[PDB]
Amino acid sequence: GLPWYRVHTVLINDPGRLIAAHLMHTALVAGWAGSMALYELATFDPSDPVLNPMWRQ
Amino acid sequence: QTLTYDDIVGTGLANKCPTLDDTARGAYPIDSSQTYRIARLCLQPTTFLVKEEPKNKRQEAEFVPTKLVTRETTSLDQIQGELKVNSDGSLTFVEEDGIDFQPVTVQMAGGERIPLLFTVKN
């Protein structure tokens, strides 16, 4: 059967499922971006942009 | 005009103090041989400002504006007291009674809620 390192070659001649893989990758990246921001907001302290700016946090 | 409860109920006007015409710029004579009183005093806050806690390094805390969250429950009214005429000519109001406190919660940026007893007691 396919070795583990080749499972995604089943998309090479399947434009539809290639698009579906790409859509899923784009979803995961957009989701991360949303999740990361929400974590950052839950932990960010905005009270001092002088001595405790975001880059310190 | 002469309004009635049923005219006002639920409108938000029960929390508003009475107002005076743009043309009421006369003057009330004070007769120093006379005894005087405030028969109604009405205070209607319009803004609540809170001093931001100036950080350690500080420089100068400002009074920051706030969002009222407790609705139209803020006004002081039906306050009475005598108006004394002092002998240097000054007047002094000494509160006796009235609805002279309201609990009020405002909210600062970031979500800190700040309750306070908005009041003129005594």
Ligand code: CLA
């Ligand atoms: C756009 C980027 C991209 C894309 C679309 C592909 C696509 C593909 N690669 Mg290539 N490749 C890339 C980048 C990319 N690669 C890079 C940067 C490298 C260097 C590391 C390689 C090195 C490489 C090798 C050596 C091989 C492939 C192979 C393949 C094919 C099968 C892969 C498979 O089934 O994985 C299956 C993978 C798994 C079941 C699990 C992998 C688990 C990894 C190690 C950790 C996961 C990390 C995690 C998901 C974080 C995401 C990464 C982060 C950077 C975002 C497929 C056509 C194979 C091939 O040619 O077959 C014919 C193959 O032999 N790729």
Ligand code: CLA
């Ligand atoms: C963008 C990511 C991505 C996408 C679109 C696909 C898409 C595809 N894969 Mg690949 N795959 C991926 C990642 C991905 N895979 C990774 C990371 C692995 C390593 C496990 C594999 C391993 C893999 C195998 C072994 C096979 C496929 C197969 C397939 C196809 C059918 C779907 C399937 O069987 O899913 C199977 C894969 C998964 C269900 C991935 C599960 C990964 C989970 C979500 C990890 C999450 C861990 C957890 C949430 C951690 C949270 C934090 C922690 C604190 C708890 C399709 C082309 C099948 C195929 O057709 O090959 C011929 C197949 O047999 N893939």
Ligand code: CLA
């Ligand atoms: C009609 C013109 C047209 C337009 C506008 C696009 C536009 C796009 N193509 Mg290409 N494509 C075209 C013709 C076109 N294509 C043709 C003729 C072919 C050959 C069949 C391809 C084959 C092709 C492949 C194989 C792939 C693309 C991908 C993409 C997308 C990659 C960027 C992305 O996902 O952003 C991120 C997305 C967003 C920010 C949101 C997108 C929302 C838009 C506005 C679409 C809304 C729904 C719409 C009705 C669906 C039809 C989309 C359109 C591509 C037809 C992008 C939307 C890639 C893709 O789908 O990636 C996921 C991909 O895998 N295209």
Ligand code: CLA
């Ligand atoms: C330009 C940015 C970019 C690019 C080019 C890619 C490219 C890729 N990503 Mg995506 N990814 C990105 C940004 C990007 N990503 C971001 C910002 C996020 C959100 C954090 C994701 C989340 C994401 C997920 C969750 C998954 C991918 C996967 C993939 C691969 C799918 C094709 C495949 O089978 O590869 C074949 C695999 C390889 C070629 C291996 C690549 C090795 C890279 C360099 C990582 C090196 C090992 C890694 C560091 C070890 C992790 C250690 C840690 C767990 C302790 C491809 C390499 C999927 C994947 O790897 O499927 C198996 C997958 O599951 N990515």
Ligand code: CLA
């Ligand atoms: C629908 C449109 C849209 C909009 C308006 C935004 C807006 C934003 N995104 Mg989100 N995003 C979107 C879609 C969108 N996103 C999609 C579809 C995904 C899934 C992939 C994400 C995933 C995502 C991630 C992972 C992250 C964001 C982040 C951000 C923020 C910073 C953007 C930034 O720096 O980009 C910078 C982008 C670039 C520098 C792209 C450069 C493109 C290179 C140069 C390609 C050039 C190749 C081209 C073909 C050559 C052209 C030829 C030339 C001659 C013209 C901003 C609020 C960031 C953030 O703060 O998240 C919370 C972040 O980290 N976005």
Ligand SMILES: CCCCCCCCCCCCCCCC(=O)OC[C@H](COP(=O)(O)OC[C@@H](O)CO)OC(=O)CCCCCCCCCCCCCCC
């Ligand atoms: C969300 C994140 C999800 C990540 C999920 C996990 C990632 C996937 C798994 C990664 C681990 C890969 C294990 C594959 C391992 C395994 O399959 O190897 C053997 C395998 C043999 O491949 P063949 O071509 O023989 O295929 C037979 C097939 O059945 C394989 O599917 O070779 C490869 O995988 C090529 C790379 C060799 C890798 C060599 C590494 C071995 C080093 C051993 C020495 C260790 C250190 C000791 C020295 C001090």
